[PDB]
C-alpha cells in the first residue's frame, strides 16, 4: 500500500504520494476567519476557510498561520489544515496510508509528541514517521555527503552530513526566513510611501518579494549604483491598479540573510553560520563539505544567491579548497522529493511507527526509536 508524504513547513503545505516526482497538492498553510458582519441571509457562511480558498476570499478574512517558527502553535488550526489536506486536496482516507511527516531540527519534543498523537488518534493512520528536512533534501540531491542550507518560511538551518552520518553537534539553527524578510520589506516599503498593514497586504508584499527581489553580488557598490542611475527600478501592479515602483529595496530585502542586523538580530549571516558549522566538524571531512553545499527551500530561490554565497564562503575559507554551491533549479521541493524517495525505499518499511507500538508505548515512542 502506498504512503503519503506531508512536508508541512511554516508557509506551504506540500503533500502527495510516495513514489511520484512532485507534490500533488501545494497550497498556503493558512486559516482565515471572517471579520465583517454578514448580511445576505442564506449565503451559507462558513466558519473558517483553509488553504487557497482562504487566499481568494482574502479581502474579508483575517489570516493566521498555525506554524510560527517551525513550531505548531495552534493545534486546532493545524488539525483543520491536515483534515483539508487529506480529504479535499488528496482525496484519500488517512486510515489506509502510512504518513511521512517532516520537522525541522532542534525544536521542542512536545511538537513531535503532539504530532504523532494527533495522527494516531484523530486520523487513525496505520503508521507514521517524522523525518528531518535536511536529510530528505540530501536524498533528493542525490548525495550522501554535504552540508545543506534549508531556508523555508520560518527557520533556516544547516545540517552537515558525511557518508550518511550526521554531526548533531554541528547543526546550527537560525530563526530568520521568508517571513522575516516579508516583514522587513513591509517596513522598508513605507519609506517610499506605500503602506501595507493588513494580513492580506502581507500576502501582497510576499508576492512582491517573490517577483522583484534579488541578492546583490556586492552590496555596497550595488547601493551606490542604484543611487546613481535609475535602471534598477521595476514596477509592480497591486490588484486594484495602483502601480508601485521599488528601487534599492529589491536587494535590500534579501540582504538581511547576510546581515541579520538589519532586523535587529545579533546572529551572523547564512554564509558565516555555514562556515562555522563546517569548522565545527572534524578536520578530515570539511574539505568534502566545502564542495557539497546543498541549497534548499523557498528562501534560497532569489536570483544571485548562489553567487553571493560562493563569494562569501570563498572569502572565508582557505584559499586552496574548492567551494561549490549546489543550487538545483527545483530546490523549492527538495524536501518533499527526498521524502518520497525515502518512503519508497524497500529497506525503510521497517522504520514506520506501527499503531501497535504507539498503543504500547504512548506518544513518547516517536523520539525514542524513530
Amino acid at each position: 500500500t502506498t504512503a503519503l508524504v506531508c512536508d508541512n513547513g511554516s508557509g506551504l503545505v506540500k503533500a502527495g504520494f510516495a513514489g511520484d516526482d512532485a507534490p500533488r497538492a501545494v497550497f498556503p498553510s493558512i486559516v482565515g476567519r471572517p471579520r465583517h458582519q454578514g448580511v445576505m441571509v442564506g449565503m451559507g457562511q462558513k466558519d473558517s476557510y483553509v488553504g487557497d480558498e482562504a487566499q481568494s476570499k482574502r479581502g474579508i478574512l483575517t489570516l493566521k498561520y498555525p506554524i510560527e517558527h517551525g513550531i505548531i502553535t495552534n493545534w486546532d488550526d493545524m488539525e483543520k489544515i491536515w483534515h483539508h489536506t487529506f480529504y479535499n486536496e488528496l482525496r484519500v482516507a488517512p486510515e489506509e496510508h502510512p504518513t511521512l511527516l517532516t520537522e525541522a531540527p532542534l525544536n521542542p519534543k512536545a511538537n513531535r509528541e503532539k504530532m504523532t498523537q494527533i495522527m494516531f488518534e484523530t486520523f487513525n493512520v496505520p503508521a507514521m514517521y517524522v523525518a528531518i528536512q535536511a536529510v530528505l533534501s540530501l536524498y533528493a540531491s542525490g548525495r550522501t555527503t554535504g552540508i545543506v542550507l534549508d531556508s523555508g518560511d520560518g527557520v533556516t538551518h544547516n545540517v552537515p552530513i558525511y557518508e550518511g552520518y550526521a554531526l548533531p553537534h554541528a547543526i546550527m539553527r537560525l530563526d530568520l526566513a521568508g517571513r522575516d524578510l516579508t516583514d522587513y520589506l513591509m517596513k522598508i516599503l513605507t519609506e517610499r510611501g506605500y503602506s501595507f498593514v493588513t494580513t492580506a497586504e502581507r500576502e501582497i508584499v510576499r508576492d512582491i518579494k517573490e517577483k522583484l527581489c534579488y541578492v546583490a553580488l556586492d552590496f555596497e557598490n550595488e547601493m551606490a549604483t542604484a543611487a546613481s542611475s535609475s535602471s534598477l527600478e521595476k514596477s509592480y501592479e497591486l490588484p486594484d491598479g495602483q502601480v508601485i515602483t521599488i528601487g534599492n529595496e529589491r536587494f535590500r530585502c534579501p540582504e538581511t540573510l547576510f546581515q541579520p542586523s538589519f532586523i535587529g538580530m545579533e546572529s551572523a549571516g547564512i554564509h558565516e553560520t555555514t562556515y562555522n558549522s563546517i569548522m565545527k566538524c572534524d578536520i578530515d571531512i570539511r574539505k568534502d563539505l566545502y564542495a557539497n553545499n546543498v541549497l534548499s527551500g523557498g528562501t534560497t530561490m532569489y536570483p544571485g544567491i548562489a553567487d553571493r554565497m560562493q563569494k562569501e564562503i570563498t572569502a572565508l575559507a582557505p584559499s586552496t579548497m574548492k567551494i561549490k554551491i549546489i543550487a538545483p533549479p527545483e530546490r523549492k521541493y527538495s524536501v518533499w522529493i527526498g521524502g518520497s524517495i525515502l518512503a519508497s525505499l524497500s529497506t525503510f518499511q521497517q522504520m514506520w511507527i506501527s499503531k501497535q507500538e504507539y498503543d504500547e508505548a504512548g506518544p513518547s515512542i516517536v523520539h525514542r526509536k524513530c
Binding site: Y214, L217, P303, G304, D307
Partner: protein, 59 residues
C-alpha cells in the same frame, strides 16, 4: 500583454546573463593573477634548486 511577458522573460535572461558575466570576468582576472603567482613561485623554486645543484656539483 503577450509582448509584455516576452519582454519580461527577456529582461530576466538579460539580468541573469549579465550577473554571470560579471562573476566570470572577476573569475578570469583572479585566474590571471593566479598565473602570475605561479610564474613567480616556479621562478623562486628554479633559483633555489639551481643553487643547491651548484653546491652539490661543487662538492
Amino acid at each position: 500583454e503577450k509582448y509584455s511577458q516576452k519582454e519580461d522573460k527577456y529582461e530576466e535572461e538579460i539580468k541573469v546573463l549579465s550577473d554571470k558575466l560579471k562573476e566570470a570576468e572577476t573569475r578570469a582576472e583572479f585566474a590571471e593573477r593566479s598565473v602570475t603567482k605561479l610564474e613567480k613561485s616556479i621562478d623562486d623554486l628554479e633559483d633555489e634548486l639551481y643553487a643547491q645543484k651548484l653546491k652539490y656539483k661543487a662538492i
